[PDB]
Amino acid sequence: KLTKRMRVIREKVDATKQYDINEAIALLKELATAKFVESVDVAVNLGIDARKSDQNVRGATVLPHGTGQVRYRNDKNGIIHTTIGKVDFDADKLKENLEALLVALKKAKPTQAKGVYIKKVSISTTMGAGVAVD
Amino acid sequence: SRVCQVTGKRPVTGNNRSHALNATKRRFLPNLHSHRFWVESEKRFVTLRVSAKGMRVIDKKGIDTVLAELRARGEKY
Amino acid sequence: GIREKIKLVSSAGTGHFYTTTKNKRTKPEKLELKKFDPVVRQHVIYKEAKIK
RNA sequence: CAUAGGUUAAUGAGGCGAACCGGGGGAACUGAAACAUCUAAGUACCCCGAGGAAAAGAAAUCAACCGAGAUUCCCCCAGUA
RNA sequence: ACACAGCACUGUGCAAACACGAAAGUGGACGUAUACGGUGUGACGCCUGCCCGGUGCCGGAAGGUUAAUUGAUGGGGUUAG
RNA sequence: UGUAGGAUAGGUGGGAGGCUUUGAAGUGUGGACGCCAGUCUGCAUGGAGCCGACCUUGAAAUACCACCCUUUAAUGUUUGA
RNA sequence: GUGACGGCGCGAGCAGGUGCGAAAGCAGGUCAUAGUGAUCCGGUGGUUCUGAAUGGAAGGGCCAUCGCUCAACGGAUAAAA
RNA sequence: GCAUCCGUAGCUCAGCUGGAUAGAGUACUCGGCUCGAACCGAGCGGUCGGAGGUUCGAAUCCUCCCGGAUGCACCA
Ligand SMILES: [Mg+2]
Ligand SMILES: [Mg+2]
Ligand SMILES: [Mg+2]
Ligand SMILES: [Mg+2]
Ligand SMILES: [Mg+2]
Ligand SMILES: [Mg+2]
Ligand SMILES: [Mg+2]
Ligand SMILES: [Mg+2]
Ligand SMILES: [Mg+2]
Ligand SMILES: [Mg+2]
Ligand SMILES: [Mg+2]
Ligand SMILES: [Mg+2]
Ligand SMILES: [Mg+2]
Ligand SMILES: [Mg+2]
Ligand SMILES: [Mg+2]
Ligand SMILES: [Mg+2]
Ligand SMILES: [Mg+2]
Ligand SMILES: [Mg+2]
Ligand SMILES: [Mg+2]
């Protein structure tokens, strides 16, 4: 079923287990396998669900590294799909970019929210697999 | 009487406590049961009046070991 | 007695509050008043809240 | 086969006694100006066992950053927490 | 007044119901529904009408509610960092 | 499946890619589900085609890849009836 | 001032911040006198007050405030013909 | 003091099951025919308990209340 291109992607990433930021960003740099330069795609799931009206969050963040001003809005399934920047960005810079996004997200969290604010944090590229961040 | 032959558990007395904290004297008796234990060494069945807690210790201690203590106690199994 | 007691909490975040009553049949809109706050020693706007 | 049982022989125990002691059970009157929780009180009483005493007893104890060093009894701490 | 023979209802299949008993056991009964216990009525004669809403009892079990038990999940306290 | 439709686009992204002897599209009803529209697809079938796709669509499409949800068909497991 | 008391009532003036007036000034609820419930217990918010070895914490204290037709209304008990 | 659920021709209820825009029986009018019975079919009689949140899509989902119910709780 799966072709060699798709099977090597899942061979490089074993998403069944969690990874640390340092390792996760290393995987992202080795996952860049496309004809065109790719963009990091954020895959962060929030324990809070936007099914409650008052718990919706709208925010903005200016990034020095750039992609540098990005916006974000929670969907119905309470998931965050932003972009920290291009894949060619240095690993250390990318870690700062996502970290700045994450701290701004913590400020946006409402008091009414219950449970683990950030249920899961994952990163993926255009054709890359999702690597969890810790 | 209601005495365990292994553990020596005997009836004890306490209080029935209501929602209004009224205290009436009561008794707590052991969960005693007459059981026929198979002792391999004598190839026989020996009947003992044991509590449910005594049954658990028989598995842990072995049927022969408890009887040795019983003879020291002179309980006349 | 059918009028129910309410508490007016200061907006300054000190946690000081006043208590009063309000008529529930009329005046549904929340109660806003400028009252003295002893913690900050200033007159600030007090907002209606729920006694709990 | 054994075992239960049975017959002998050796020792020991049986009962009594004032209080004190340990343990197994355990009230009510009364006080609360009534009365249930509580108090009286683990008292009266009943039962079992032991001794000249009994019981307890050689820290899985206390202290507070200094230390003390089994148990029992008396005076304080204190009618304090 | 009570008892009374008689009458009716009801429980009871016999390790019977029931009763006395912490329990063993005993009575019921060395009886077995033509028996036993309980209740009301009270020979005999003619008869015993209507009400199941209330309170009990009996039958039903789909749904609602609901204990011990199990402990999903969320919230706090503490601190490695 | 709002609709519009390009309509079996659930949403969320990346998304000119897609596509590809590995069998170009592909025939044989393979059936199921589903709007019963349509869709993927069971083994062969033949031999280079295959596809982003403007008015509209919130959006641009079962072209595309990653990530979720829903619907869940089966699968072991763990508790119960 | 008025009460045995618990208590209740009146009050110029002072400090900080206000409102209405150009100002003098007035405003610490309503013309006044009824519109009410002690203590205990529990709940909520605040607080460098306390924190049973120490650092926290629980709990307590203080401040704000909630829950009795306790109407037999100085209220015997949470619970009674 | 919470927890859940219910509210729809005048009435009794489906809720047009959770947004891709109201149904029946009864009440009433007319008609079918017919002395009343008794039968039938049309029509009429509802803005969906009310007010806030979303989205292109809610009487239907979220918040807030109102009334009703069943639960629990309960020792000022
Ligand atoms: Mg007593
Ligand atoms: Mg003697
Ligand atoms: Mg007494
Ligand atoms: Mg008395
Ligand atoms: Mg008395
Ligand atoms: Mg005792
Ligand atoms: Mg008579
Ligand atoms: Mg009669
Ligand atoms: Mg009846
Ligand atoms: Mg009936
Ligand atoms: Mg002025
Ligand atoms: Mg005036
Ligand atoms: Mg401490
Ligand atoms: Mg504290
Ligand atoms: Mg301590
Ligand atoms: Mg406190
Ligand atoms: Mg009085
Ligand atoms: Mg009195
Ligand atoms: Mg009390």
UniProtKB/Swiss-Prot annotation, chain A:
| Statement: the UniProt record of this protein carries the keyword RNA-binding | yes
**Which regions form coiled coils?**
none
What molecular function does GO assign, one term? structural constituent of ribosome
Q: Which UniProt keywords apply?
A: Repressor, Ribonucleoprotein, Ribosomal protein, RNA-binding, rRNA-binding, Translation regulation, tRNA-binding
One CC-aspect GO term: cytoplasm
Superkingdom of the source species:
Bacteria
Keyword rRNA-binding applies: yes
Share an example GO biological-process annotation for this protein: cytoplasmic translation
Q: Which residues carry this modification: N6-succinyllysine?
A: K95, K106
Q: Which CDD domains match?
A: Ribosomal_L1
Query: What does it do?
Result: One of the primary rRNA binding proteins, it binds very close to the 3'-end of the 23S rRNA. Forms part of the L1 stalk. It is often not seen in high-resolution crystal structures, but can be seen in cryo_EM and 3D reconstruction models. These indicate that the distal end of the stalk moves by approximately 20 angstroms. This stalk movement is thought to be coupled to movement of deacylated tRNA into and out of the E site, and thus to participate in tRNA translocation. Contacts the P and E site tRNAs.
Question: Member of which family?
Answer: Belongs to the universal ribosomal protein uL1 family.
Q: How does it assemble?
A: Part of the 50S ribosomal subunit. Cross-links to the P and E site tRNAs.
This protein's name: Large ribosomal subunit protein uL1
At the highest ranks, the source species' classification is: Bacteria, Pseudomonadati, Pseudomonadota, Gammaproteobacteria, Enterobacterales
**Gene from which this protein is expressed:** rplA
Swiss-Prot record, chain B:
Quote the InterPro entries the UniProt record gives: Ribosomal_bL28 (IPR026569), Ribosomal_bL28/bL31-like_sf (IPR034704), Ribosomal_bL28_bact-type (IPR001383), Ribosomal_bL28_sf (IPR037147)
Q: Name one GO biological process term.
A: cytoplasmic translation
Keyword set, alphabetical order: Ribonucleoprotein, Ribosomal protein, RNA-binding, rRNA-binding
Q: Its domain of life?
A: Bacteria
Q: Name one GO cellular component term.
A: cytoplasm
Q: Hey, which family's this protein in?
A: Belongs to the bacterial ribosomal protein bL28 family.
- Full protein name: Large ribosomal subunit protein bL28
Species annotation: Escherichia coli (strain K12)
Curated annotation (Swiss-Prot), chain C:
- Membrane-crossing residues? none
Q: Which GO biological-process labels does this protein carry?
A: cytoplasmic translation; response to antibiotic; ribosomal large subunit assembly
Q: Which domain of life is it from?
A: Bacteria
- One function term, GO molecular function aspect: tRNA binding
Q: Name one GO cellular component term.
A: cytosol
InterPro entries assigned = Ribosomal_bL33 (IPR001705), Ribosomal_bL33_CS (IPR018264), Ribosomal_bL33_sf (IPR038584), Ribosomal_zn-bd (IPR011332)
PROSITE patterns named in the record: RIBOSOMAL_L33
Gene3D superfamilies (UniProt xref):
Ribosomal protein L33 (2.20.28.120)
The record's section on Pfam families has: Ribosomal_L33 (PF00471)
Keyword Signal in annotation: no
Disulfide pairs here are none
UniProt keywords (A-Z) are: Methylation, Ribonucleoprotein, Ribosomal protein, RNA-binding, tRNA-binding
* Family designation: Belongs to the bacterial ribosomal protein bL33 family.
As a miscellaneous remark, the entry gives:
Surface exposed on the 50S subunit.
The record's subunit annotation is: Part of the 50S ribosomal subunit. Cross-links to the P and E site tRNAs.
Q: Which PANTHER family match?
A: 54S RIBOSOMAL PROTEIN L39, MITOCHONDRIAL (PTHR15238), LARGE RIBOSOMAL SUBUNIT PROTEIN BL33M (PTHR15238:SF1)
> What's the protein called, per UniProt?
Large ribosomal subunit protein bL33
Q: Which organism is it from?
A: Escherichia coli (strain K12)
* Gene (UniProt): rpmG
